[PDB]
Design a protein around this ligand. Structure first.
Ligand SMILES: NC(=O)C1=CN([C@@H]2O[C@H](COP(=O)(O)OP(=O)(O)OC[C@H]3O[C@@H](n4cnc5c(N)ncnc54)[C@H](OP(=O)(O)O)[C@@H]3O)[C@@H](O)[C@H]2O)C=CC1
Ligand SMILES: NC(=O)C1=CN([C@@H]2O[C@H](COP(=O)(O)OP(=O)(O)OC[C@H]3O[C@@H](n4cnc5c(N)ncnc54)[C@H](OP(=O)(O)O)[C@@H]3O)[C@@H](O)[C@H]2O)C=CC1
Ligand SMILES: NC(=O)C1=CN([C@@H]2O[C@H](COP(=O)(O)OP(=O)(O)OC[C@H]3O[C@@H](n4cnc5c(N)ncnc54)[C@H](OP(=O)(O)O)[C@@H]3O)[C@@H](O)[C@H]2O)C=CC1
Ligand SMILES: NC(=O)C1=CN([C@@H]2O[C@H](COP(=O)(O)OP(=O)(O)OC[C@H]3O[C@@H](n4cnc5c(N)ncnc54)[C@H](OP(=O)(O)O)[C@@H]3O)[C@@H](O)[C@H]2O)C=CC1
Ligand SMILES: CC(C)(C)N1CCN(c2ccc(N3CCN(C(=O)N[C@@H]4[C@@H]5C[C@@H]6C[C@H]4C[C@@](C(N)=O)(C6)C5)c4ccccc43)nc2)CC1
Ligand SMILES: CC(C)(C)N1CCN(c2ccc(N3CCN(C(=O)N[C@@H]4[C@@H]5C[C@@H]6C[C@H]4C[C@@](C(N)=O)(C6)C5)c4ccccc43)nc2)CC1
Ligand SMILES: CC(C)(C)N1CCN(c2ccc(N3CCN(C(=O)N[C@@H]4[C@@H]5C[C@@H]6C[C@H]4C[C@@](C(N)=O)(C6)C5)c4ccccc43)nc2)CC1
Ligand SMILES: CC(C)(C)N1CCN(c2ccc(N3CCN(C(=O)N[C@@H]4[C@@H]5C[C@@H]6C[C@H]4C[C@@](C(N)=O)(C6)C5)c4ccccc43)nc2)CC1
Lengths: 264, 261, 260, 264
């Protein structure tokens, strides 16, 4: 899509109607806090109602125009579809959909855990598609934005996270193809793919402990950079400690291959 | 070393989606090389004709097992049956896909899930089922993917998601096999448009571009797998093959590798 | 280098004091005309005194704030130095230094032509450094810009232009290094290196005839893109017919290596 | 077309080799390795006295023969005459190692046109003159030209503007003639050596009080240059860090050189 040739300003999110998934902790929670500070209307989701309630409490205090939570599992495609319709009724519409949740994952060699591969695909990928289908009519009304939280493991291969990597690679293939479809069918809904390096979330620090030794970037800045990129309608956001990653990760050969086919 | 057809002589090979298109051409090349072949697809009628032709071409043996890769039990039992019939397995060629059309994504989640189950998940189930036999022979896994599995194209969103998932999964396990000394090679084949009857029906006339020969495509997949190459590139244009390579990805992968204990 | 984060508007060049070398023909001539239409002050140079006179008169006609010529050969380092002093005296300062001239060159296999190697180095490179040195005190006063016209042959190897390719590569090495120096020593003079593919100029079309067969980009658009990048204080300008070159020619690995 | 074989010191046995800037640093180390390999060696630099000591050590090391010719590479007549005499001394030429540079310090560029001109003359123009004079003997032997460059000849660094310009010019000239030779079937290889900081006495004095990075050993450096030269490799990379080697490669330039070639 066409990005906004503008600098980011917090006023851009004031009164905006935002959904944040997997917002009970880590990056999702930090995104909900930044959005609350900007005076946005926020609807947060995850499975734990107790942690989600704590997130909403802080959001209301930070100055959100409104803040609500709806608890449930993204393993359940009916909840996924119903969540969006409910989130839209609470805010009276939708401007931005931030898809960020993932199924529980640990660092382990792949052996025979087909059920983890399937669950990663359903939760990390399939539910995102279901949420997008549910949200698209409201997003078309507001010329909104879809923000997809991915990973460096969704752009390059990593040992010990095969199922996870597969699900993140699937997000790129699906959302990048539909971005091209939206360009041709003149659908004014932006799609931002966020390619993240290791972030200092509670889950990440526990998961890589004693296995991986590398710099973890701050979650607060990470969340803000995701919100900025989505607000500016950027196609991709890259955020990592090294940079290095930042400038090596871009793929101009892919861009030429995609442009040269945007003529056949 | 250069490829020699004798590398496949007497080799025990599975080819999925082999009743037509690229898969069928692969069974034929393997048959001419004197390999033991087990082919699969849902249609027994078409598989019967592939098997009789494989025998005419000089296959050491050729048999079919019919079933749907939507069924994970079939996928698991298929590998056990094929391997028990040939007395082992040297090479697993994963090529089947669910029926696909060029269409703008239109709330068809069922097609996204089916594409993920057939084009991606069943490949994992087949690999898990085949791994003990492939470890015994220091065998090979050949994963047929697409240019739409490396770059974004409109009208094949579900298909593209499934092909991208193959890269993430198989490229990740390849790193794991390298560090855990699993002597089973993994080859990802990135194909441009191929002149299969299915591709020609689906693309003409929404798109205008040169389709590469299916016979030569099939041979190049076999060569790459036999040579244990990580990735095989095949397109009408040599310029496309130059653009598929991602050296930055390879640097990042090596850099991130050193963080692991 | 901090580029101006605004879109290009021709008003950016109104009343600006601009030198254009190699301005008697091709891209240099086209640059003088664009700047004239934008209402800039122009001082054009090359050897052809009669052609420069015709260029200056057409510049005044297009709406240049002033137009003057100083004729001479950039083989002569004394001339190069005095040309800048004299050009700066005519305009009452200097805002943009556009280094575009090159020695006459053809496509030939290199065998033993040391003369052509030395001449390309002296004219296409050394004179650019002499002009920059002479221009710097004025550019420092105006927070001005140095625009270096290079080539794709200044970024990648091409057979048949070995001497020319050496001089263009030397430009990248010299100017990108001084750009790093200006940022650390806080010298607010911008440096734009322009990487061009084949352009439809008369000299180029005659030189590549029957030797090289490929699309040539228009000289008028090329000239404009050079001025835009310079005005916007961009580090590098890429201009070529194929949108393969433009995004493949960037070097992120070089950027990492430089980040120190 | 590089040699599809492992390097062996025996590849240099009885080879006729010129090493410029061989009185000290990397050049001296290259002369010593070649001597240990039993090559015939002709060394040059300005230092008559230290060149005699280098030569005597080369003989002690087992060189087939060793001679020196002293002079300045600022003098193009000396450069031309040196090659002719080196060729007579050895009875031909198999390898031309171009390594000398004019005196260089780390300094901000101000108005030092003399240093720019001298760097261009010595570090670049004398290499071309030496190549031209050597070519008939190199064509007779299917020989090799080895050009010692630098990271400052691939990327921009402050404080070395004149030097960097001269090293970039070696890349443009020698890489263009390499394309010419391959298409006109001239069986003379051209090796461009891209070096990171090396622990020579001159480098260590010049960086003291400025940058603080690990300098690689001069003896391993010298050998790596000879190996790349003997193997007919287009480029040799040598640095203290393996990460530098990965970053020096320019696959986009290699792609572009290929598409531009088809138009000839
Ligand atoms: N942290 C990092 O280093 C990196 C993170 N990322 C990406 O950033 C995003 C967030 O990362 P991070 O904050 O570390 O993740 P966390 O593990 O901290 O949180 C994941 C969130 O998803 C929720 N969730 C888990 N299972 C389900 C389910 N079945 N249904 C619905 N929601 C569920 C969790 O809440 P609850 O369990 O209560 O449901 C929680 O709110 C992810 O998309 C991840 O891939 C990318 C690269 C690196
Ligand atoms: N042709 C092209 O242009 C390109 C092809 N490719 C890839 O190459 C491979 C083959 O392509 P192509 O030959 O054109 O494909 P075809 O459509 O010709 O054949 C697909 C094969 O899969 C079988 N199949 C279909 N559905 C199922 C199912 N549910 N369970 C099991 N098998 C099934 C089919 O047989 P049956 O229906 O009887 O089951 C058939 O044998 C695929 O992986 C594709 O993505 C990649 C890029 C371009
Ligand atoms: N055209 C193309 O395809 C490409 C062009 N370029 C670059 O663009 C720039 C201009 O190209 P182009 O317009 O094609 O070249 P032209 O040959 O058309 O013009 C070159 C100019 O330099 C002048 N000049 C020549 N010799 C001298 C000298 N000794 N002293 C002073 N001035 C001299 C000429 O004027 P006079 O003879 O009167 O002195 C003329 O005005 C150059 O830097 C070139 O390398 C880069 C890539 C491709
Ligand atoms: N050392 C490093 O960190 C790096 C070195 N390099 C490259 O490696 C090469 C050697 O570097 P290094 O060994 O460090 O340098 P040194 O300064 O140690 O030696 C350079 C040699 O050139 C000779 N020389 C100097 N002036 C002239 C002249 N006018 N005519 C002829 N010979 C001359 C010197 O001998 P005498 O004074 O007797 O004439 C000396 O033998 C150079 O090409 C350099 O650019 C590249 C990257 C980093
Ligand atoms: C040059 C220097 C400075 C030394 N660099 C070193 C390399 N580098 C880098 C490389 C890789 C990574 N990641 C990002 C991808 N990835 C990931 O998304 N993991 C996530 C993360 C942890 C765990 C698995 C997975 C889901 C988690 C969850 N919440 O359930 C649990 C959160 C990943 C996986 C395993 C190891 C590392 C990573 N981040 C940064 C840049 C910095
Ligand atoms: C740079 C230059 C040289 C100018 N090139 C431009 C042209 N180019 C190119 C682009 C795209 C393509 N393909 C390959 C991927 N892809 C694909 O896998 N399709 C398949 C194919 C057709 C249909 C969808 C899908 C499954 C099919 C089945 N059997 O069910 C049915 C078989 C695809 C999709 C739609 C159109 C084209 C393609 N091939 C080549 C390469 C680069
Ligand atoms: C296949 C398609 C898609 C058609 N592409 C092909 C590849 N491509 C491309 C490649 C190369 C080039 N150049 C640019 C460098 N270069 C150059 O600067 N030449 C210049 C030019 C001509 C001559 C030598 C030199 C000085 C000249 C003068 N004024 O004295 C006289 C002006 C050059 C040299 C010889 C041949 C080509 C070129 N331009 C475009 C983009 C398009
Ligand atoms: C990304 C990571 C992995 C972290 N690395 C960052 C750091 N790095 C690096 C950077 C720069 C350098 N050099 C090489 C170029 N260069 C050089 O050629 N110098 C030479 C050297 C010194 C002096 C100038 C010049 C001629 C000298 C002579 N003999 O007259 C006198 C000898 C140079 C200059 C000053 C400082 C350093 C260097 N070497 C390594 C490698 C990559």
């Amino acid at each position: 899509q066409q990005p906004l040739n503008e600098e980011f300003r917090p006023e851009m999110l004031q009164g905006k109607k935002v959904i944040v998934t997997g917002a009970s902790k880590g990056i999702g929670r930090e995104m909900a806090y930044h959005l609350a500070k900007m005076g946005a209307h926020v609807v947060v989701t995850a499975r734990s109602k107790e942690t989600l309630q704590k997130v909403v409490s802080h959001c209301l205090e930070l100055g959100a125009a409104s803040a609500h939570y709806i608890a449930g599992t993204m393993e359940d495609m009916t909840f996924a579809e119903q969540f969006v319709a409910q989130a839209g009724k609470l805010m009276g519409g939708l401007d931005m959909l931030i898809l960020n949740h993932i199924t529980n994952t640990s660092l382990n060699l792949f052996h025979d855990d087909i059920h983890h591969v399937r669950k990663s695909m359903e939760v990390n990928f399939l539910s995102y598609v279901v949420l997008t289908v549910a949200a698209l009519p409201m997003l078309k009304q507001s010329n909104g934005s879809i923000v997809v939280v991915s990973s460096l493991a969704g752009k390059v291969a990593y040992p010990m996270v095969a199922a996870y990597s597969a699900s993140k690679f699937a997000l790129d293939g699906f959302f990048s193809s539909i971005r091209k479809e939206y360009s041709v069918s003149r659908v004014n809904v932006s799609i931002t793919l966020c390619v993240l390096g290791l972030i200092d979330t509670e889950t990440a620090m526990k998961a890589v402990s004693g296995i991986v030794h590398m710099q973890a970037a701050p979650k607060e800045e990470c969340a803000l950079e995701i919100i900025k990129g989505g607000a500016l309608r950027q196609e991709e956001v890259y955020y990592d400690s090294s940079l290095w990653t930042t400038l090596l990760i871009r793929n101009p050969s892919r861009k030429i291959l995609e442009f040269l086919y945007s003529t056949s």
